[PDB]
Amino acid sequence: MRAKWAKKRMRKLKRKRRHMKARS
Amino acid sequence: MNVDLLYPDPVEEQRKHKLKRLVQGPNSYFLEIKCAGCQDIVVVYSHANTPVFCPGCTSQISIPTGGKCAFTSQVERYR
Amino acid sequence: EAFAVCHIYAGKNDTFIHVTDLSGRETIGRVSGGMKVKRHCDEPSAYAAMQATQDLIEIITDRGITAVHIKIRADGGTGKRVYGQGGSAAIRALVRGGIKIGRIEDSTPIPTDRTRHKGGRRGRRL
Amino acid sequence: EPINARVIEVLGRTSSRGGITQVKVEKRQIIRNVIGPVRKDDILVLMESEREARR
Amino acid sequence: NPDPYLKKEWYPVIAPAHFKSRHIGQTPVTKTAGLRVATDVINHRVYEVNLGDLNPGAEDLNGNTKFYLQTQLVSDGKCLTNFHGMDITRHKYGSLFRKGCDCIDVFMDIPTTDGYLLRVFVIAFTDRFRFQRRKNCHVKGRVIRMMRAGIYETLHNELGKVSIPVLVTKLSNFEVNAKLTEALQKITMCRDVMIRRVKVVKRPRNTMELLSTMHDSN
Amino acid sequence: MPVKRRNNGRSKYNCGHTNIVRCQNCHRCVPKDKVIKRFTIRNIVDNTIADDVLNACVIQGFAIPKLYNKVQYCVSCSIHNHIVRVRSREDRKIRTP
RNA sequence: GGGACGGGUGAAACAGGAUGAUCCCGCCGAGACCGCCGGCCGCGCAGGCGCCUGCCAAGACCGCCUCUGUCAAUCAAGGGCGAAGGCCGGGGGCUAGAAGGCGAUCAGACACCACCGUAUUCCCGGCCGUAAACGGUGCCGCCCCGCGGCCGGCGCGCGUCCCGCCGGCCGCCCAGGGAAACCGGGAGGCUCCGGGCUCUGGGGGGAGUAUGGCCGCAAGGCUGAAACUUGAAGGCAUUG
Ligand SMILES: [K+]
Ligand SMILES: [K+]
Ligand SMILES: [K+]
Ligand SMILES: [K+]
Ligand SMILES: [K+]
Ligand SMILES: [K+]
Ligand SMILES: [K+]
Ligand SMILES: [K+]
Ligand SMILES: [K+]
Ligand SMILES: [K+]
Ligand SMILES: [K+]
Ligand SMILES: [K+]
Ligand SMILES: [K+]
Ligand SMILES: [K+]
Ligand SMILES: [K+]
Ligand SMILES: [K+]
Ligand SMILES: [K+]
Ligand SMILES: [K+]
Ligand SMILES: [K+]
Ligand SMILES: [K+]
Ligand SMILES: [K+]
Ligand SMILES: [K+]
Ligand SMILES: [K+]
Ligand SMILES: [K+]
Ligand SMILES: [K+]
Ligand SMILES: [K+]
Ligand SMILES: [K+]
Ligand SMILES: [K+]
Ligand SMILES: [K+]
Ligand SMILES: [K+]
Ligand SMILES: [K+]
Ligand SMILES: [K+]
Ligand SMILES: [K+]
Ligand SMILES: [K+]
Ligand SMILES: [K+]
Ligand SMILES: [K+]
Ligand SMILES: [K+]
Ligand SMILES: [K+]
Ligand SMILES: [K+]
Ligand SMILES: [K+]
Ligand SMILES: [K+]
Ligand SMILES: [K+]
Ligand SMILES: [K+]
Ligand SMILES: [K+]
Ligand SMILES: [K+]
Ligand SMILES: [K+]
Ligand SMILES: [K+]
Ligand SMILES: [K+]
Ligand SMILES: [K+]
Ligand SMILES: [K+]
Ligand SMILES: [K+]
Ligand SMILES: [K+]
Ligand SMILES: [K+]
Ligand SMILES: [K+]
Ligand SMILES: [K+]
Ligand SMILES: [K+]
Ligand SMILES: [K+]
Ligand SMILES: [K+]
Ligand SMILES: [K+]
Ligand SMILES: [K+]
Ligand SMILES: [K+]
Ligand SMILES: [K+]
Ligand SMILES: [K+]
Ligand SMILES: [K+]
Ligand SMILES: [K+]
Ligand SMILES: [K+]
Ligand SMILES: [K+]
Ligand SMILES: [K+]
Ligand SMILES: [K+]
Ligand SMILES: [K+]
Ligand SMILES: [K+]
Ligand SMILES: [K+]
Ligand SMILES: [K+]
Ligand SMILES: [K+]
Ligand SMILES: [K+]
Ligand SMILES: [K+]
Ligand SMILES: [K+]
Ligand SMILES: [K+]
Ligand SMILES: [K+]
Ligand SMILES: [K+]
Ligand SMILES: [K+]
Ligand SMILES: [K+]
Ligand SMILES: [K+]
Ligand SMILES: [K+]
Ligand SMILES: [K+]
Ligand SMILES: [K+]
Ligand SMILES: [K+]
Ligand SMILES: [K+]
Ligand SMILES: [K+]
Ligand SMILES: [K+]
Ligand SMILES: [Mg+2]
Ligand SMILES: [Mg+2]
Ligand SMILES: [Mg+2]
Ligand SMILES: [Mg+2]
Ligand SMILES: [Mg+2]
Ligand SMILES: [Mg+2]
Ligand SMILES: [Mg+2]
Ligand SMILES: [Mg+2]
Ligand SMILES: [Mg+2]
Ligand SMILES: [Mg+2]
Ligand SMILES: [Mg+2]
Ligand SMILES: [Mg+2]
Ligand SMILES: [Mg+2]
Ligand SMILES: [Mg+2]
Ligand SMILES: [Mg+2]
């Protein structure tokens, strides 16, 4: 992948993890 | 041709910067001018940028110019 | 001896040949390159422009006009500044129709400082 | 009403496949394209003198 | 549609008395019918006329200046025009520019002694000396400032208090030009120093006396 | 990818940032010191009719006016339309017009 | 005013027009912008910097037989500024235009091309602190074959020029250097290795991730592992 879009994908992943850990 | 650095020729030494000469020295000097209407004579710095007057006159007789200074209607010398 | 003004709009996509009086407020004959053709891509060509000018000649001789000043323009604005293909064809079809020529001038509208033209900062990617 | 022009000289092969030739005919110096084999001083039948060849 | 030119008629247009080719042309209008009066709707039209058409013969000199004249009275079947502005042609303006030199543009507001207000645009360029080593003509700021100030004081002196007919005399004579050079030549080398535009910003509503003196020679 | 040019493909000397111009063919944004620049002076009427306008002119001493246009293109459009060519490694150093 | 199409494209189609458009000319409104001149020009600590006129404070350089007397260099912590996009609260709203809508193309086209358009783009008060933020080259000091161009200040000479000096921005280049490309105002004076100071790296992945901490309204930013996996990844250059 072009590294810019890999960074975008990783940011979306980290934000999903923060949201799921927010519950409980 | 064989130049010796310990005794440089003064003519080609005066054309260099005052600080990178063998022995640093000033570039300026003093000189005598005569008032256009007074018999007497006064001694003036060559790079002046401050008022200089006659013994009699109240008009300033020098024009500062960023280098050697010019004068108004007076005739000069070198001593 | 009876002067009018010819405005020739020589653009990318069509041509206009338009004769008015000296003030511009009253028109005497107006034709376009797209009223002589069937294919949309041939409206700005030299041949449509010449056949349209030949009928402008017919209109404006019968109304008594004998000479024209020429004001020729491109699109202008923030777009193209060079003339379309039919521009000089109108002038030639005017010279070979009997009209005499006065003053000539370019009237393309040029800005002194401008708004932003379309396309984006990467251009038309074709 | 077609006119008779006369080739004054030959300028070269125009199209991408040979084919037509650019010629100077004649009191004018009109330049036109021809399909056939043209020598010098050939007479051509022009349907109009209005159109001039490109370049 | 019926052909509207069955109801049209043409009127002459006449230039002020300063010029020589006093006939500009004719203009068409629909005959009076109802409420629209023929000699009410052709009033105040604006005509751009080349100076080489108004004073013919000196083509090299007069061929790049244009005068704007607008009618302000229709008397005895004739339209009587008055000064509306001055402008140079587009190719003349484009020709003045090169790379390596300086361009100076200045404008100012000048009242006249008979109720007008003009905006005057002047342009000047720097030039080579006959014996200089370099090929660029750029000048320092002490020179640009002096050139601007000289232009201001000159246009203040020459056009400070003039009338419209005297202004038109000078504009069609290039008198003012021939002195903007004179002021600016004592400073640097400069090639094309000219008034490039005159705009009319505001005028009195009634100009009957001005029009009367402009048309009948006086 | 080593370095191809000493000027890095532009003319930028002792400054941080320069102005933006629009390519006249495709309208992309180009820095001013990189864009390809050409000046042209031409006649408003084509030369192939430059004597028939002249002979059908009433004004005595008329001279055909000219057009003054500065064309500016981006790198891609300049190569595509043959304003500049791809050159040999030795030839790239030549600045002659 | 005049009377049949105009727009748009490689070619077209959707938008427009007898409620008269497109086109010509005059008048009015609003908000952006600052052309040609414009550059191997110039300025600033970097980010950056171009309409007119006025005001305000500053700056480096040069020139000097002016004053002081080591008052300096580099810098964890700490402070300040910082393109564009983005955020909070007000204002404004022309143009262009993420999102969205629509016409084509195509096997498909949710894209490229055409058309319409919201945030945004502009102003004010704050926040955020990142860019291929590049010369991919930290700062101070010394020596260094030469030939040129341009910018600022000064000095000598003849009769604008001409030869120098200092400071800046550039081109070419002997030696020397290097894996080479190339550098050469250093990337030279270095296996013949030591002038001073600060920062960073130690095969490729995993990974700039998990976790903890600080900052932020948020979007983020800064700091930052391990298990495990693998025999290469990479630089510059030659022939096809
Ligand atoms: K990256
Ligand atoms: K990236
Ligand atoms: K990114
Ligand atoms: K020296
Ligand atoms: K000295
Ligand atoms: K001195
Ligand atoms: K049609
Ligand atoms: K605009
Ligand atoms: K546009
Ligand atoms: K648009
Ligand atoms: K678009
Ligand atoms: K774009
Ligand atoms: K755009
Ligand atoms: K776009
Ligand atoms: K873009
Ligand atoms: K971009
Ligand atoms: K791009
Ligand atoms: K982009
Ligand atoms: K585009
Ligand atoms: K200045
Ligand atoms: K100054
Ligand atoms: K200035
Ligand atoms: K590489
Ligand atoms: K590289
Ligand atoms: K570049
Ligand atoms: K620069
Ligand atoms: K610059
Ligand atoms: K160029
Ligand atoms: K490009
Ligand atoms: K049609
Ligand atoms: K705008
Ligand atoms: K300038
Ligand atoms: K300059
Ligand atoms: K300048
Ligand atoms: K500057
Ligand atoms: K400068
Ligand atoms: K300068
Ligand atoms: K400048
Ligand atoms: K400047
Ligand atoms: K001094
Ligand atoms: K210190
Ligand atoms: K130190
Ligand atoms: K520091
Ligand atoms: K620090
Ligand atoms: K710190
Ligand atoms: K900031
Ligand atoms: K920012
Ligand atoms: K925003
Ligand atoms: K808006
Ligand atoms: K706005
Ligand atoms: K956006
Ligand atoms: K879309
Ligand atoms: K897509
Ligand atoms: K795609
Ligand atoms: K739109
Ligand atoms: K937004
Ligand atoms: K907005
Ligand atoms: K923007
Ligand atoms: K805005
Ligand atoms: K910001
Ligand atoms: K980086
Ligand atoms: K760079
Ligand atoms: K450092
Ligand atoms: K200089
Ligand atoms: K200099
Ligand atoms: K300077
Ligand atoms: K200088
Ligand atoms: K100098
Ligand atoms: K100098
Ligand atoms: K020096
Ligand atoms: K120096
Ligand atoms: K120097
Ligand atoms: K330097
Ligand atoms: K440091
Ligand atoms: K570091
Ligand atoms: K680092
Ligand atoms: K690091
Ligand atoms: K965590
Ligand atoms: K918070
Ligand atoms: K919150
Ligand atoms: K928020
Ligand atoms: K949060
Ligand atoms: K968070
Ligand atoms: K975090
Ligand atoms: K490799
Ligand atoms: K690598
Ligand atoms: K690689
Ligand atoms: K690499
Ligand atoms: K090699
Ligand atoms: K290799
Ligand atoms: Mg000195
Ligand atoms: Mg801060
Ligand atoms: Mg801040
Ligand atoms: Mg818009
Ligand atoms: Mg829009
Ligand atoms: Mg960073
Ligand atoms: Mg960086
Ligand atoms: Mg870096
Ligand atoms: Mg320079
Ligand atoms: Mg430079
Ligand atoms: Mg250099
Ligand atoms: Mg380390
Ligand atoms: Mg955490
Ligand atoms: Mg944490
Ligand atoms: Mg190799």
Burial classification of residue C77, based on how many CB atoms lie within 10 Å of its CB (0-12 exposed, 13-18 middle, 19 or more buried): middle
Note whether E120 and E159 are within 8 A (CB): yes
Q: How far is the CA of A9 from the centre of ligand 85 (A)?
A: 28
Q: State the Cα–Cα distance between residues D40 and D24, nearest whole angstrom.
A: 10
Q: State the Cα–Cα distance between residues E44 and E27, nearest whole angstrom.
A: 13
Q: Which residue has the tokens 């933006």?
A: F20
Give contacts of E 90-129 with C, CB under 8 A.
90-91
- H or E element in which residue C16 lies: strand C15-20
Which residues of chain C are within 8 Å of residue F62 when distances are taken between CB atoms?
Answer: 103
- Cβ neighbors of F94 (< 8 A, separation 6 or more) are F87
| Of the candidates E14, E70, E13, E7, the residue with the CA atom closest to the CA atom of residue E38 | E7
Q: How was this structure determined?
A: cryo-EM
| Of the candidates E21, E23, E26, E24, the residue with the CA atom closest to the CA atom of residue E9 | E26
Q: Which residues pair with B42 in a beta bridge?
A: B33
Task: Look up the domain containing B20 and give its range.
Answer: 1-79
Note whether D26 and D6 are within 8 A (CB): yes
Q: Which residue has the tokens 């020295």?
A: B25
CB contact under 8 A, E97 and F65: no
User: Pairing mode, if any, of strands E8-14 and E78-88?
Assistant: parallel
Q: State the Cα–Cα distance between residues B35 and B39, nearest whole angstrom.
A: 7
**What's the total number of domains in chain E?**
1
Radius of gyration (C-alpha) of chain D in whole angstroms: 11
Task: Look up the domain containing E12 and give its range.
Answer: 6-218
**What's the total number of domains in chain D?**
1
- Cβ neighbors of C80 (< 8 A, separation 6 or more) are C12, C74, F24
Q: How far is the CA of E127 from the C1' of G156 (A)?
A: 29
| Angle between helix E141-158 and helix E177-185 axes, rounded to 10 deg | 140
Q: Which residues pair with D7 in a beta bridge?
A: D25
Q: Which residue has the tokens 């003030």?
A: C23
Q: C–D: how many Cβ contacts below 8 A?
A: 4
Burial classification of residue E128, based on how many CB atoms lie within 10 Å of its CB (0-12 exposed, 13-18 middle, 19 or more buried): middle
Amino acid at F87: R
Q: Is F25 annotated as a binding residue?
A: yes
Resolution in A: 2.8
Note whether E211 and E103 are within 8 A (CB): no
Note whether C16 and C90 are within 8 A (CB): no
Instruction: Give the side-chain half-sphere CA count within 13 A for B49.
Output: 5
Using a 7 Å CB cutoff, list residues 66-85 of E near strand G: none
Residue of D nearest to C85 (CA): D54
Task: Look up the domain containing D37 and give its range.
Answer: 1-55
Q: Is E79 on the interface with C (CB under 8 A)?
A: no
Amino acid at F65: P
* Residue E90: CB less than 7 A from any atom in strand G: no
